[PDB]
Amino acid sequence: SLRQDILLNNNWNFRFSHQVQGDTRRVDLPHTWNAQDALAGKIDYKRGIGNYEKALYIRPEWKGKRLFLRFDGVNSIADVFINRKHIGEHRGGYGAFIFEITDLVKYGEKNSVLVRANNGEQLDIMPLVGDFNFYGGIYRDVHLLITDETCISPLDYASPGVYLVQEVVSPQEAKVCAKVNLSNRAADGTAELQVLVTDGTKVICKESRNVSLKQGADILEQLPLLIQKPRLWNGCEDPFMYQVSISLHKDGKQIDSVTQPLGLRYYHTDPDKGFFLNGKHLPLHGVCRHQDRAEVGNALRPQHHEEDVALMREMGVNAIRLAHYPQATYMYDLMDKHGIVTWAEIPFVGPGGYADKGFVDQASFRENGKQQLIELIRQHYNHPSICFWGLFNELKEVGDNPVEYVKELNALAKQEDPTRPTTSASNQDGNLNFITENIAWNRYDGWYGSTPKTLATFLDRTHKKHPELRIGISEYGAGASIYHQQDSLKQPSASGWWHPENWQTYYHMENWKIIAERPFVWGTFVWNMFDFGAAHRTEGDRPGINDKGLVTFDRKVRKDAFYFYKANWNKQEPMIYLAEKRCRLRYQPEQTFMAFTTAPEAELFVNGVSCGKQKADTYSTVVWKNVKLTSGENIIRVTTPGKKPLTDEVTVEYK
Amino acid sequence: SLRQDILLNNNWNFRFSHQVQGDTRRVDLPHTWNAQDALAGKIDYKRGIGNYEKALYIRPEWKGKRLFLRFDGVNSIADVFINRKHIGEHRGGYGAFIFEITDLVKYGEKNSVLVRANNGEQLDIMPLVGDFNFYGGIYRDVHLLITDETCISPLDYASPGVYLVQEVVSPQEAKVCAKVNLSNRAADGTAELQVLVTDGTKVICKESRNVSLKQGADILEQLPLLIQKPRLWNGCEDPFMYQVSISLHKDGKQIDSVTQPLGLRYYHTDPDKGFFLNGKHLPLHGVCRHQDRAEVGNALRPQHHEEDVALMREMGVNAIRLAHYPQATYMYDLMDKHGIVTWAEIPFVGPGGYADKGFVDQASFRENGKQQLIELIRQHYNHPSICFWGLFNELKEVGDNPVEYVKELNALAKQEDPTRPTTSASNQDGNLNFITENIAWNRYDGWYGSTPKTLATFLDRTHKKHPELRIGISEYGAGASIYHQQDSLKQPSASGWWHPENWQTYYHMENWKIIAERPFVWGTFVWNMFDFGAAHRTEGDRPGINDKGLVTFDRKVRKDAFYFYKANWNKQEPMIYLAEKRCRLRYQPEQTFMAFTTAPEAELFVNGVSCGKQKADTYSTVVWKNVKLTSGENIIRVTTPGKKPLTDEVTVEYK
Amino acid sequence: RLAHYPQATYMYDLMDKHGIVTWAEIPFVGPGGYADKGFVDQASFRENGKQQLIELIRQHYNHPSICFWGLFNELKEVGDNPVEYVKELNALAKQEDPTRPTTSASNQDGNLNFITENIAWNRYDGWYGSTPKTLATFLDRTHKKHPELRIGISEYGAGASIYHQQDSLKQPSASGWWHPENWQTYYHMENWKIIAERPFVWGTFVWNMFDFGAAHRTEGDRPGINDKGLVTFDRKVRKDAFYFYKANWNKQEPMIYLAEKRCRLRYQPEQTFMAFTTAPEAELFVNGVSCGKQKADTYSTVVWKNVKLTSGENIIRVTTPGKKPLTDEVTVEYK
Ligand SMILES: O=C(O)[C@H]1CNC[C@@H](O)[C@@H]1O
Ligand SMILES: O=C(O)[C@H]1CNC[C@@H](O)[C@@H]1O
């Protein structure tokens, strides 16, 4: 009677097609075959076909039901076979996809499921280029879905089949259109469709409709909902969601059901005053996050998403840009749950300072880009956290000019979802910046040359020249190795093998001050919350890594800048953090010590003797200058005021 | 006034897309990037995108002409850009392709030509699998073609635009339909089309037609030709060809012209008596040849084709199977010139003893297969040497079953060219063998197990059970290293690291005797004329090589079997060849010496002392038994009779 | 010169058999234009070097072909200075075998050149920069300044791919991916003329008879190869310079060889054809029509200038005099 969702992750037989003999090894999903070679900095890591095969017992009692194989993600092309007969293809590495196998299997026996995954280079599947790894394989879950022959359809771009369209939302009332896809393979007849909105045990809406479904029908039903005096999803202040059950009934029996969240809110972006959520100004304190991790590549487990979100909330993050592609359903779920305003985007990624192009002007590429956009929007439609749809990152006009195609994507986004604005992330001047509703730039003033001050100049000049633009900062950052430490502050070469941590700290303190004074900037996103994989990189403390994270690739170590942001953004958790603790060897005659704290002041101790109190500045920073160390070991301690104080401590050597 | 054909092979800038920085190196076409890694036996050799860029000066005086970039071959996908704007894509590694660039260039300046070549794995472009290397890149010539605005069209699958259809051919008369594609971009008006057939300075046909061509017209004209008492293209006996000039004229001025050969013949294949050319039985003494070579991979220069053909003619080859794909125009030209009956085929290649599949049942694969077949037939239509179109090699029915698709390809071949029969090369029993007009099998009785005798049993049983089949042998062979030698004859393990030359010799002598007695076998083709590259191989004297050649990979050394065939097939060139000369170390008490000769007998000398004469058998082999060597060095000499004899000699050591 | 190490007994046997005067050497090899050092000054290295020298001399003592023992190739004094150790090796060679002189192959000025009885230099004037003429200047100046030195040329050469061809003569970048065959031909003709006029040079050795393996190379028509051979790595193809030397050095075997046959595509308005022959003269034919005879010069070279080709295919033939002549032929395309 109930819909079943069966995980098919364990024990698949794997081999590369370049291994011609046919023998296989066991693997377990999520899986990528690029977790060792790409992460070792091998620039020509394996990009081609890997094959997964599993024997699936089709239970006799599933006869009469409908059966679907749903894939959460396979990078980048998947060809699926049942009993070695081809059933379909998916092109795109980040969107879910589904095939019905109801009439393709033999009931009561083992059937072969074969997936031939290809992450070889293509010129007709975005992303074509990018500063990250194109990890190959079935790197998200695989499900066997089992439903009634009359069901809420899972066949609409592999979405849940329900779109809760937020037409009008205010504190007085919300009008929602529940769009429901129905799929019928039963004999001609009827069913009753019910849409139930609840808050815990309390019933908020219950709307019903009798529907006549022809054999073979695949149709869209639209049920209007009205909620009086709604409780709004209000970011981290109150991430409230209703639950919606959508169900089908025949003769007073429920025969199918799906649940989706309903987090109601309204928003706008003001060119002069920034982002407003539910009628109130909201600074977007944002970071970016790639979907990979040390040692496992992009084969992330649920605890990895959970941990990433825990670290961001610890830091006081209230906004995120999930670059550079559609990410996991579970990850958008955590954004919903924790109230994090989210920018979600398609992988329409340009070259940046590197070679080749993000756009190749041929129908196959362009049609496939539209498919990946429709996938993004339909598959992730109901997540309240998503407040912006991103259409590109660092495209450029030279050669194949993407401006007209990006206009087509913008119009398609607005058609698919008029309830959210489009955005984009640019490193260019010119017409590419004037298509999406909001615009943002990737700025590295003070890292890739210049000084942080030119970010202030760029922001002010652009805002004055183009007062209609809603200006954001879609990336800003600096590299750091936790193993590169020096007593003095000196700007390093960005592309070199020396990325002292103190420069990243300096960079973020200076850039944050510029942002904090400019409320017309509707959101800013640190590049990046975590170090991440990019095989071609040859910089910092090891190849193959982009080290602009606030936290290391294995999520183990928070860099000093993490705590600068935590003090400023997470003000209600008491803390004190001494900066430059990893710089154990000191040689400067005049030592400077610096702490980040939520307290109004702090006290410094050197070798157990107080150096006195210093006040925190407006950026939660306390600084002591001309501190005198003695030759050899020195114990440095900082303490907040109060009867029960907080402390941080380190032993440094002075010579 | 004249059509120009300008080679664009020298000095291109190259880089891999996995090299992200943008710097390049000079390369010169023909080029493959897999001439070192695949040939070293690296099984995961580079399969992905390589980029070639060249500045092309567009001369001011070309304004008013039409300009085309014609590619003879790029493996396997090519995306072409002019001034970095995409102009088109080709999918398929072995057929020619063309783009007009007339209205895409700036006249009087340098224009960028960029080719982005991809040999990454695909499941929608045959060949999907195969016992050979998928060498990537622009491995054949690139041309700039310059024509009048009214021209014999080069735009019909990049063919010459002229199809000389051999409708009826006999010694009394030949009826030919000259099909001519015309392309017009001039203002509405007329031109005169002339088709001129000559034999040296003698005029055989001259047919003319006035044609009215609308602006933008792309049309087909058909001019009937009648040749009384023709001189026929008759294989190696008389490879005679007429020359055909096809020209366009305006106001008594020739404005365009193309030349094509006309080699007239008729043929049939008899299920009981074999192949008949021009009404006369012709044993097809065939070999196969791949288009690669030591050190250069498939980036063959003209002297490489010329040399390969010289070696085959030296051996008395009169038939060839140019496996496993469309090969170079120049190579089919040499077959025409030297009278070699040719099997040409599409790369519809199955796995053999290896994993995966030759057929993936999806529209993209199937449509692309049809395109590669149409390319093959239209591009190579006028070569008299081609007498069979091959549709597949070792497909199998399990999983995706290609039988119905192969029937579609057979019907398409017959539509495109009713003047040649279809054929195929099978390693299967069953329905796949009953589609093409002729059928052939790949047989390794005595190499991959069993004994040569079971080839005789298979041939006789099949012929008796299925008397309607025209049976051929599309492959037969055995491996040999010239560096593996042993005094005794012992069958080696096929997959092992020991391939003694004497077993390959034994294999071919025994298999040839079986074939020679069976005239119902219409043709047999040795696998292979030359050792060739197959990165995944781990056998013989080094990895990465299929060593079943009669001649080594560098074309330097002829193995003993080469001379067995030469004695039997090239009977009018006097020769004597002592076998087993490379086996320098002898230990058998009773030595056997063996020579291949065109003479009726030969004489053996050991240490300058005659051992007497022995008669050649029916297979041009002379054998001396129980020859007594003395400890240490022995000089062995064999001599033909006559006042001016031929000799072969070797020094062996006996111990 | 069987560089850069003791080679097979069977190879020295063939030198004995065929009468080839042989330089045999130990692998005491320096870096040349590359990094690191040929000499590391520690007892283990030095004692092992002496062992390899004693091995060379005792193992190959009886080969008449061996007339020189080579002690090093391109060592340099900077850092660990091998001069004193090379003197020790020289004294050891003379002790082990007073019946042969020592020699060495240098790319340096200074004291390293004054230890062995004969000395030789590796010279690439006209390949690694400069012009062949500076070889003549170096040889004459050294000989005048140091009249006691027995001066040889232990290496001279230029790279060539048989797949790199161009109608015009232009010096390529040595380290680049374009090594046109005609520059190697030019290089050897010019250097040979300089050597031939200087009998005080006791021996000269082409680097190299064959292309050979050097994994770190990234030049010519493929990586991993030193392409200065007169013959290709697989021993299949003789480059044009092979036949220049054959005409000059093997005078009693009649021959004619047309140069630049691999350069099939011609575009120069005025074509030059060049043949190497043992004959006193030869005749050129273009499309079956004689262009007349030309005399061979003192270096067995015959040259025809301002030859007129017609658009498209041209058949070029050269023939020696006599009732039974020798010929060489090629078809080129002119456009
Ligand atoms: O250079 C960087 O670190 C960033 C520049 N903007 C685009 C990012 O993908 C890239 O990682
Ligand atoms: O095993 C072999 O050597 C041959 C078997 N038949 C197919 C060929 O491609 C293959 O090379």
Per 3-state DSSP, chain C is made up of helix, strand and coil in percentages (nearest 5) of 25, 30, 45
Q: Is the CB of A527 under 6 A from ligand 1?
A: yes
- d(C-alpha B197, C-alpha B204), whole Å: 5
- d(C-alpha B501, C-alpha A176), whole Å: 81
Q: Which residue of C has its CA nearest to B12?
A: C177
Residues of A in contact with B116 (CB under 8 A): 123
Task: Evaluate whether the domain defined by B267-574 bears CATH number 3.20.20.80.
Answer: yes
Q: What is the DSSP string of C284-309?
A: EEETTEEEEEEE--TTSEEEEEEE--
B229 in reach of chain C (CB within 8 A): no
B203 in reach of chain A (CB within 8 A): no
Q: What is the whole-number distance in angstroms between the Cα of residue A549 and the centre of ligand 1?
A: 11
Which of B14, B121, B128, B354 would you mutate first to test chain A, the one with the most A CBs within 10 A?
Answer: B121
Marked catalytic residue, from B100, B345, B375, B394: B394
Residues contacting ligand 2 via CB (< 6 Å): B 131, 352, 394, 442, 475, 527, 546, 548
| Backbone φ, ψ for residue C301 (5° rounding) | -115, 130
- Does a cis peptide bond (omega within 30 degrees of 0) precede residue A83? no
**Residue B116 is nearest to which of A86, A120, A123, comparing CB atoms?**
A123
Q: Which residues of C147-167 are buried (b: 16+ CB within 10 A; e: fewer)?
A: eeeebbbbbbbbbbbbbbbbb
Alpha carbon B196 to chain centroid, angstroms: 30
For residue B56, give the nearest of B146, B144, B148 by alpha carbon.
Answer: B144
Q: Which residue of C has its CA nearest to B13?
A: C177
- d(C-alpha B221, C-alpha B210), whole Å: 10
CB-hemisphere CA count at 13 Å for B423?
31
- d(C-alpha B529, C-alpha B525), whole Å: 9
Q: How far is B81 from chain A (nearest CA, A)?
A: 9
Q: Which residue of B has its CA nearest to A89?
A: B362
Q: Is C122 annotated among the ligand-binding residues?
A: yes
CB B632 within 8 A of CB B623: no
- d(C-alpha A255, C-alpha A151), whole Å: 8
Q: Where are the alpha helices (DSSP H) in A417-520?
A: 453-465, 501-516
Ligand 1: which of A424, A442, A443, A548 to mutate, most ligand atoms within 8 Å of CB?
A: A442
Nearest atom (ligand 2) to Cα of B534: 11
Amino acid at position B60, single letter:
P
Ligand 2: which of B322, B424, B442, B476 to mutate, most ligand atoms within 8 Å of CB?
A: B442
Nearest CA to ligand 1 atom 10: A131
B311 in reach of chain C (CB within 8 A): no
Q: Hey, what CATH topology would domain A1-148 get?
A: Jelly Rolls (2.60.120)
Strand extents, DSSP E, chain C: 22-25, 66-73, 102-106, 119-122, 151-156, 204-206, 212-219, 222-226, 256-258, 265-266, 271-277, 281-286, 289-295, 301-307, 312-319, 327-334
Q: Is A527 annotated among the ligand-binding residues?
A: yes
A400 in reach of chain B (CB within 8 A): yes
Burial of B253 (0-12, 13-18, 19+ CB in 10 A): exposed
Q: Is B442 annotated among the ligand-binding residues?
A: yes
| Backbone φ, ψ for residue B309 (5° rounding) | -70, -40
Q: Any idea how long chain A is?
A: 655
Q: How far is B505 from chain A (nearest CA, A)?
A: 28
Number of neighbouring beta carbons within 10 Å of residue A16: 18
Q: Is A569 annotated among the ligand-binding residues?
A: no
User: Residues of CATH 3.20.20.80 domain(s) within chain C?
Assistant: 1-254
Token duo for residue C51:
């062992």
User: Residues of CATH 3.20.20.80 domain(s) within chain B?
Assistant: 267-574
Are C224 and B27 in contact (CB < 8 Å)? no
| Furthest-apart CA atoms within chain C: distance in Å | 73
Are B28 and C265 in contact (CB < 8 Å)? no
- The residues of A assigned a catalytic role are 394
CB B96 within 8 A of CB B25: no
**Residue B18 is nearest to which of A43, A49, A399, comparing CB atoms?**
A43
| B/A Cβ contact: 3+ pairs below 8 Å | yes
Q: Which residues of A426-447 are buried (b: 16+ CB within 10 A; e: fewer)?
A: bbeeeebbebbbbbbbbbbbbb
- Does a cis peptide bond (omega within 30 degrees of 0) precede residue A76? yes
CB B273 within 8 A of CB B512: no
Q: How far is A290 from chain B (nearest CA, A)?
A: 20
**Residue B123 is nearest to which of A16, A47, A116, comparing CB atoms?**
A116
CB-hemisphere CA count at 13 Å for C14?
5
Q: Could you tell me the CA-to-CA distances from B107 to B56, B63, B81 in Å, in that order?
A: 10, 7, 17
Residues of B in contact with A81 (CB under 8 A): 399-400
Sign, CA dihedral B397-B403-B404-B405, equals: positive
Residues of B in contact with C178 (CB under 8 A): 11, 26, 28
Q: Hey, what CATH topology would domain C1-254 get?
A: TIM Barrel (3.20.20)
Q: With H, G, I as helix, E, B as strand and everything else as coil, classify residue A569.
A: helix
Token duo for residue B257:
């012209």
Nearest CA to ligand 2 atom 8: B131
| A/C Cβ contact: 3+ pairs below 8 Å | no
Question: Domain spanning A575-655 has what CATH number?
Answer: 2.60.40.10
User: Residues of CATH 2.60.40.10 domain(s) within chain C?
Assistant: 255-335
Burial of A569 (0-12, 13-18, 19+ CB in 10 A): middle
Q: Which residue of C has its CA nearest to B31?
A: C221
Q: How far is B548 from chain A (nearest CA, A)?
A: 19
Q: What is the DSSP string of A316-364?
A: T--EEEETTS---HHHHHHHHHHT-EEEEE---B--TTSSS-S---SHH
Q: Could you tell me the CA-to-CA distances from B217 to B177, B187, B188, B249 in Å, in that order?
A: 21, 10, 9, 17
CB A410 within 8 A of CB A391: yes
Q: Hey, what CATH topology would domain B149-266 get?
A: Immunoglobulin-like (2.60.40)
Q: Which residue of A has its CA nearest to B78?
A: A123
Residues of A in contact with B352 (CB under 8 A): none
Residues of B in contact with C223 (CB under 8 A): 36
- d(C-alpha B247, C-alpha B256), whole Å: 6
Q: Which residue of B has its CA nearest to C237?
A: B556
Number of neighbouring beta carbons within 10 Å of residue B1: 8
Q: How far is A181 from chain B (nearest CA, A)?
A: 28
Q: What is the DSSP string of A112-143?
A: EEEEEEE----SSSS-SS-SS----B--S-EE
Which of C161, C162, C168, C178 would you mutate first to test chain B, the one with the most B CBs within 10 A?
Answer: C178
- d(C-alpha C230, C-alpha C212), whole Å: 11
B42 in reach of chain A (CB within 8 A): no
Q: Which helix (H) or strand (E) holds B136?
A: none
Q: Is the CB of A14 under 6 A from ligand 1?
A: no
Rg of chain B over all Cα atoms, to the nearest angstrom: 27
For residue B8, give the nearest of B25, B23, B24, B27 by alpha carbon.
Answer: B27
Q: Where are the alpha helices (DSSP H) in B523-572?
A: 560-569
Which one of the ligands is nearest to B428 CA? 2
Q: What is the whole-number distance in angstroms between the Cα of residue B46 and the centre of ligand 1?
A: 26
Method: X-ray
Which of A17, A20, A84 would you mutate first to test chain B, the one with the most B CBs within 10 A?
Answer: A20
Q: How far is B28 from chain C (nearest CA, A)?
A: 9
C-alpha torsion angle, residues A271, A277, A279, A282 (rounded to 10):
-70
User: Residues of CATH 2.60.120.260 domain(s) within chain A?
Assistant: 1-148
Are C236 and B26 in contact (CB < 8 Å)? no
Are A121 and B51 in contact (CB < 8 Å)? no
Alpha carbon A54 to chain centroid, angstroms: 30
Sign, CA dihedral A530-A535-A537-A538, equals: positive
| Backbone φ, ψ for residue C232 (5° rounding) | -70, 165
Burial of C217 (0-12, 13-18, 19+ CB in 10 A): middle
Q: Any idea how long chain C is?
A: 335
Ligand 1: which of A546, A550, A553 to mutate, most ligand atoms within 8 Å of CB?
A: A546
CB B637 within 8 A of CB B604: yes
Q: How many CB pairs under 8 A join A and B?
A: 119
Ligand 1: which of A126, A134, A475 to mutate, most ligand atoms within 8 Å of CB?
A: A475
Q: With H, G, I as helix, E, B as strand and everything else as coil, classify residue A237.
A: helix
Strand partners, C152: C120
| Backbone φ, ψ for residue A151 (5° rounding) | -145, 165
Q: Which residues of B393-421 are buried (b: 16+ CB within 10 A; e: fewer)?
A: bbbbeebbbbeebbeebbebbeebbebbb
Q: Hey, what CATH topology would domain C255-335 get?
A: Immunoglobulin-like (2.60.40)
Sign, CA dihedral A490-A491-A494-A496, equals: negative
Number of neighbouring beta carbons within 10 Å of residue C318: 28
